[PDB]
Amino acid sequence: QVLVPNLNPTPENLEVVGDGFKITSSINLVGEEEADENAVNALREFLTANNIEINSENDPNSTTLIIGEVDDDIPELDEALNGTTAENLKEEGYALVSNDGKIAIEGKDGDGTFYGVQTFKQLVKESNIPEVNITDYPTVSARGIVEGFYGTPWTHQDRLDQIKFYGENKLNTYIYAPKDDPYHREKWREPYPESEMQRMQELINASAENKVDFVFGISPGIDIRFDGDAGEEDFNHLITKAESLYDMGVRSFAIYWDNIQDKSAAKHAQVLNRFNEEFVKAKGDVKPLITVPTEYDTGAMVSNGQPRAYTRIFAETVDPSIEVMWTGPGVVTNEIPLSDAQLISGIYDRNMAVWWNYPVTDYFKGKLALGPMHGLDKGLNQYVDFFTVNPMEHAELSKISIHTAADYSWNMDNYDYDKAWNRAIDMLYGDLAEDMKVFANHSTRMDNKTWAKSGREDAPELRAKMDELWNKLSSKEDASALIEELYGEFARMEEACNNLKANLPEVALEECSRQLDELITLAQGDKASLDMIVAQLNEDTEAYESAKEIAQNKLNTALSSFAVISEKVAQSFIQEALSFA
């Protein structure tokens, strides 16, 4: 009896209708000449990789795969879906049926068929597939990543790997906007050199291959001139630059005004409108223009429930067709409640786009952000139609957070951040999943103790036992049971991190090796901290003085380490223990 494996995103409607069956070593492929070229290629790579030959002629004793779009006239597909249809679903939707030795995929459109194949790829383990009836479609139409952080831009190989990863998780958007690319911002007028344009072409091609909308961003707010000949010339520089990327296949554009000194709301919006009319609309096959205003968090946008000067004028002027992004109540903030999206959607009289600054860490580079989407309201889709996360300069470990963003944006009302977090690590880390959870569990909360705060609290279940222990001691209760529980947790912290150091692939390890060393140190310091409590209860001062020096030794190492992790849990416990009782 074959079970449904981990899926991501969580499909909207899935029922098991059979025991499952084993896919034969050679399959009948049906509808591939009419079906979406990218879907079929994804399917061929998968088949090749899992050693499944495709029959040159029909063989009745071999599994049959039928694939196609609603708008292909292919009846063998309607027959095999067995009353299930993709006809009535929203764009990017699909239907999938596996039953009685046949697998049928029907996409509402091609994007849909590609996503149907991704789910097919996820359902097969070792040639076995469950027998299921699926109809599936996204909550949010635009889902993906804005590469818009400060610091070391992603490499070419980072981005190509990222793009393949988006397609596998049905993320359909990637915005190119690295702050430290000189041609994106510092020197936005200058054309890309020939060799960089060759790298660009590769990224564009891979994007199309994986159904990702590659958005080319530009940030001219540093030094753009708006008026007379200078404003003409500067405007034509935007046109020239977008044209040269259009001519390579780019069909999405963004013009950003964030983090600049000039706050000319009217001029910003007029540039957008002019570009929207002379470029986006003229071309006719270019997707809606994206922007971010110079005021882009509720705090900077709104005062006493009423829009600020910049925002009011910008909202008044910007054409309704342009997507406008905002980061929520602060630049980096715990939550975006429904009421915040309602307010801002109200000022703009339109559905908004989110620029979510998590897991970005450019504001506190010592910590990894390894937690799930957290504090984003599950009804946000009432006011939000475009969702993007800003990742870290660490592309590999950003995958954990993005994985959960794929689930939240595709099936948002079903989204369980703990379940989604667990699934991300299970799917991405495999044999090492259990141990990686132990480590990652301590690295979900970002707090620069100033204005940036976001993410699930660090290992809450452990913080609760620690808190509980200080009560049992100040309350004179028998704590001996809790101390053994806690010794166990600290040993496992050490065990897990040593295992990761030994066994993680370079691609993950090269990104977090320093933080593993830090958590091992703190685990050792928490253990000595308990030894201190034990010795204090035994009025055994020799053991106390010895444990205390070790505790100070481990703490001294962490405070001087670049690495930051478990500030308020593993670290604080040692600081707590060094404060009498």
């Binding site: 630049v331 600054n357 504001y363 100033t450 204005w451």
Partner: peptide, 4 residues
């Protein structure tokens, strides 16, 4: 070096 970052926002805010």
């Amino acid at each position: 070096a970052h926002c805010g």
